[PDB]
Amino acid sequence: TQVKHMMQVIEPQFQRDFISLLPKELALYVLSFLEPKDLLQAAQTCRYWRILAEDNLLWREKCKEEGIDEPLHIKRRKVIKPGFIHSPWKSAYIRQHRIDTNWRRGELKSPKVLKGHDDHVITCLQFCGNRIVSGSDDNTLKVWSAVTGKCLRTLVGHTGGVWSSQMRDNIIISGSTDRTLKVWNAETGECIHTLYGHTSTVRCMHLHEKRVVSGSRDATLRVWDIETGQCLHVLMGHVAAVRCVQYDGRRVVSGAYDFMVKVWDPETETCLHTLQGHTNRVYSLQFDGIHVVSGSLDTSIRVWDVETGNCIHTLTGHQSLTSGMELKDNILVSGNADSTVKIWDIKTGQCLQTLQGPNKHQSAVTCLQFNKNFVITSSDDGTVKLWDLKTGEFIRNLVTLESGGSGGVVWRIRASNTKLVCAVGSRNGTEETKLLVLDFDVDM
């Protein structure tokens, strides 16, 4: 009845064209075989076609195809001309398409600069809704607004450097060389719990629902209840430091400087599998419930089956340390000290792209994110680069530190659909430590 209202009321009578004259179901059926680019061009043909092409369900389907889940409702109205009844799904498509475009080629707006952690390293970074959490070897964490750039809180408590953190809207958890974890209220900044049990640095952690698992230089892992503050379980069997950990609520997976990856059932504190094969330290890890993926100093990345413990793929071709990997639906993106990023299909072992070329990173890759369109990579060269995940081609430098080749580095990044946040600094004073936040939203 959107279309009924608009036809009966704009009154576009006497057109001499094919689709104007069809029943409207059939005109819409025809229009359904078109891609959005075409629908937008059809819409500029005449009033009648415009009204048809603005059909709400036609665009709901187009949105589900790009995985756009909510419609978008605007307001500034106007009543500009005789009345138009916009489709929320259509403006949601268009929103997303302009956002994408803005990341690829939109003028780089000057980013907000959040100065903090003076003269120290930002060792972990978290970004959740409109909150950013930076953690540091100054012993603190700071909570910031991604919207205004203000520092909202400063989480003081640790007597030791912060090196790991997790966040889920308003719960933050930190891990330190002071051998503890801490649980914090982001809004108020109070430390609600302090978790004792480890005796050496809390190097990594992973949070799932109401439990975090921590891994430590002590060679153990502990599983902790976040509400109660109690340590539920203790996972013993590693022989050297645990550098990386994943937890899905059902199995813990840990990777350690003993070259080993272990899979555990936490409830019974038992190691179900020791995954052996890496010929050097394991540094990075991903896990999706079915596959474990482990990055080594071996320069290898191994893919394994949690259920059996069997190596499925040994993915090769990086030349140095794989420092971080992201895994999503059987696509894996790996960042390496060799300055290169690769994209892999972990079902087949295929290396789909290697990100390099004339605008390659000049030094180690420190961090990365990706979605179905882009990879974003950061580096000690002081840039953050945007690449096309489908073609593997460089698109552009999102950030280029002037001090990049004199000490400035990008330690890590987080991105939302709309925003990019970068932790930046230097070991020699050439770049003051800070976060950079860039906005790619569009007006809408």
């Binding site: 390293v121 450097g161 190097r203 230089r217 420092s323 000290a337 180690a364």
Partner: peptide, 10 residues
């Protein structure tokens, strides 16, 4: 060649 920051040893 270069590895990321890591906590100091004991």
């Amino acid at each position: 060649p270069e590895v990321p920051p890591t906590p100091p040893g004991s």
